[PDB]
């Protein structure tokens, strides 16, 4: 049993028939290379499909590789399953045929569940290091030249300088001098105790400032770190917008939006604020780490130009 000792991996189970359309059969060891499988947390099946699509075939979902409406990925009672819905995925053989001119062994890869190595064009057994970025994606900003292991960044000073009376800290504990602080975490001494993989509880009230003090480990590449953090932007940072007073602020740890999910999520968040920016304070040591800063919450209809944040991200990550 591949899913032994797991309570929260409905998403992985729902992916099995989607992945089988490309010949893929994930072992427990291979599933353990997905962080939320190893730690047994709730996740988006769609984000994980995109991750596995890149790892196996060097292409993300915007390639159309899994765009055949073969198998549903549906959510019922906050759990993923394959019940009928208009959200269907599967290997698209016409897309495979189109891609085969540029990638001659790709049809064999998707027939047999083997990694198509984008550097060599040859087929490999599963290894998450082979394809680190999707070759079809024009990255919206620069990624970092090098990553190092630093201590966790202390953002107490940054948050204390923000305008606002009432603060909700989500994730790790943070003292904020001069402000009122509530704490949301899965620790016994938190103000609101809850599993953070299930998002902000609807019973949490409204605040002037919400700080998402949640980090994602770097393993293989900036891209990987960003795509692994995407679900946290969706479940925490985006949900936080419903817990803000009019004109309130949301600040979130992030790593840019190297992946398609993060880009979409950040765009959706940014549209609900008068102002959005990216900051990397002196206290932020980890090279890939930034703060997304969203100021002046409302529900006025407005567009967001992602080139603004992308310009800043490129500047931060290239020292420009």
CA separation for the pair 215, 86 (Å, rounded):
33
Residues in the chain: 320
DSSP state of 67: B
Q: Which of 188, 192, 184, 165 is nearest to 232 (CA)?
A: 184
Q: Quickly count: other Cβ atoms within 10 Å of residue 255's Cβ.
A: 30
Residues 61, 9 share a domain: yes
Count of the separate structural domains present in the chain: 2
Residues 108, 191 share a domain: no
DSSP state of 197: G
Please state, in angstroms and as integers, the Cα–Cα distance from residue 238 to each residue in 16, 110, 200, 264, 278, following that order: 28, 35, 9, 11, 16
CA separation for the pair 170, 192 (Å, rounded):
9
Residues 163, 110 share a domain: no
DSSP assignment of 231-265 equals HHIIIIIIHHGGGEEEEEEEEEEE----SHHHHHH
Among candidate residues 113, 136, 159, the one where a domain is terminated = 136
DSSP state of 90: B
CATH number, domain with residue 74: 3.90.70.110
Catalytic entry in 43, 53, 79, 279 = 79
Q: Which of 4, 27, 12, 25 is nearest to 79 (CA)?
A: 12
Among candidate residues 80, 109, 136, the one where a domain is terminated = 136
- For residue 78, report the phi and psi dihedrals to the nearest 5 degrees: 60, 30
Instruction: Return the bridge partners of 210, or none.
Output: 168, 250
Exposed e or buried b per residue across 227-245, where buried means at least 16 C-beta atoms within 10 angstroms of its C-beta: bbbbbbbbbbbbbbbebbe
Catalytic entry in 10, 53, 226, 241 = 10
- Please confirm, yes or no, whether 79 is among the known catalytic residues: yes
266 touches 299 (CB < 8 A): no
Residues 320, 217 share a domain: yes
CA separation for the pair 52, 164 (Å, rounded):
41
Domain boundaries, position 268: 137-320
Six-digit token string for 187: 């620790």
Among candidate residues 104, 136, 168, the one where a domain is terminated = 136
- Please confirm, yes or no, whether 10 is among the known catalytic residues: yes
């Amino acid at each position: 049993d591949v899913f032994q000792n797991k309570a929260n991996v409905c998403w992985a189970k729902a992916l099995v028939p989607v992945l089988k359309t490309a010949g893929i059969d994930m072992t427990t060891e291979q599933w353990n290379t997905v962080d939320y499988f190893e730690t047994d947390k709730a996740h988006s099946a769609e984000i994980v499909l995109n991750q596995l699509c890149v790892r196996f075939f060097g292409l993300d979902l915007d390639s159309g590789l899994f765009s055949a409406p073969t198998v549903p990925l549906s959510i019922r009672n906050n759990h993923w399953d394959n019940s009928p819905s208009p959200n269907m995925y599967g290997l698209n053989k016409e897309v495979v045929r189109q891609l085969s001119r540029r990638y001659p062994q790709l049809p064999r890869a998707v027939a047999t569940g083997r990694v198509y190595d984008m550097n060599t064009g040859t087929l490999r057994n599963y290894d998450p290091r082979i394809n680190l970025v999707p070759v079809n994606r024009r990255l919206p900003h620069a990624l970092v030249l090098h990553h190092n292991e630093h201590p966790q960044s202390d953002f107490s000073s940054f948050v204390s300088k923000l305008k606002g009376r009432t603060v909700l800290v989500v994730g790790e504990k943070l003292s904020v001098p001069g402000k009122m602080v509530d704490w949301l975490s899965d620790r016994p001494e938190a103000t609101f105790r809850a599993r953070l993989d299930l998002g902000i509880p609807g019973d949490v009230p409204k605040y002037d400032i919400i700080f998402v003090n949640v980090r994602t480990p770097y393993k293989y590449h900036h891209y990987q770190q960003c795509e692994d953090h995407a679900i946290k932007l969706s479940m925490l940072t985006k949900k936080a917008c419903l817990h803000l007073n009019p004109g309130g602020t949301c600040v979130s740890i992030g790593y840019g939006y190297a992946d398609r999910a993060s880009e979409s999520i950040i765009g959706a968040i940014a549209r609900q604020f008068k102002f959005s920016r990216v900051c990397k304070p002196k206290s932020s040591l980890e090279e890939t780490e930034v703060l997304f800063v969203f100021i002046g919450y409302d529900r006025k209809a407005r567009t967001h130009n992602p080139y603004k944040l992308s310009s800043t991200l490129t500047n931060i990550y290239t020292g420009s």
